[PDB]
Amino acid sequence: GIGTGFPFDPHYVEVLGERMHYVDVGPRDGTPVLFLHGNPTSSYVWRNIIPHVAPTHRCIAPDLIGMGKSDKPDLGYFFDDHVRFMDAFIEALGLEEVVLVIHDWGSALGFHWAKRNPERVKGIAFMEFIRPIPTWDEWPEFARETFQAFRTTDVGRKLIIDHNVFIEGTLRMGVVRPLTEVEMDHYREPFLNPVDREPLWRFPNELPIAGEPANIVALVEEYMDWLHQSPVPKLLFWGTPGVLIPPAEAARLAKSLPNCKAVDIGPGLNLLQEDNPDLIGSEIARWLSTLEI
Ligand SMILES: [Cl-]
Helix, strand or coil: CCCCCCCCCCCCEECCCCEEEEEEECCCCCCCCCEECCCCCHHHHHHCCHHHHHCCCCCCEEEECCCCCCCCCCCCCCCHHHHHHHHHHHHHHCCCEEEEEEEEEHHHHHHHHHHHHHHHHHEEEEEEEEECCCHHHCCCCHHHHHHHHHHHCHHHHHHHHHHHHHHHHHCCCHHCCCCCCCHHHCCCHHCHHHCCHHHHHHHHCCCEECCCCCHHHHHHHHHHHHHHHHCCCEEEEEEECCCCCHHHHHHHHHHHHHCCEEEEEECCCCCCHHHHHHHHHHHHHHHHHCCCC
């Protein structure tokens, strides 16, 4: 079955006075492949994808600040905080040119960094990514009232912080197949202490839905405008029914975006990595072999 282990040796780097953890496997030479997770996951989400890429390419998978095995300072964990820490993580590792593999909030980080530093990005593989959601009617009906409740300081914090609903409920409702207890324990581990759950609540409050928050909408629009014109090689994975993007819009987008290959992974919600890791990993590896890297 789908692997549950996390066999990767820990690596740590000091970033803005805090320690960040990252996976680092594969050959030391060549262009590195930088894997960026989202909410409420960690590098654990890439555990079954990396082994398809690591034979031929260096794979770097950081835990976002406040998440995974990274340090957990008392921040607001706004998108801007993650931008500051990820910018500094990339420089602290001395990365020059990279290929990005990105998901959920990791995709906002990756696309925003790529738009600002396009000379350093040699390809982008992406899935279930942050885009403007024009109205609440484009958010999946089965999850709509809860995400609306998440975006409050009263009910939303009670659910996400006090009761850990993003881990115990939303995560599982983001995967089609059932998650095992061992997998759930890996996802629970960074957030056993309720005071460490701020990122889990701030992230859904940053989602660009129905024009709010205006600053995130503007930033995401800017990187989507870039992506619609840039020649950067692109690989889009999508599933049915999806969460952040529905199938027809995914297929339409992959046709519209320059130099973009699309892969239908079959059934999927948000964490496509948990529903078809072998296809995602094998297709990333095949696509990498076509790039000038
Ligand atoms: Cl979120």
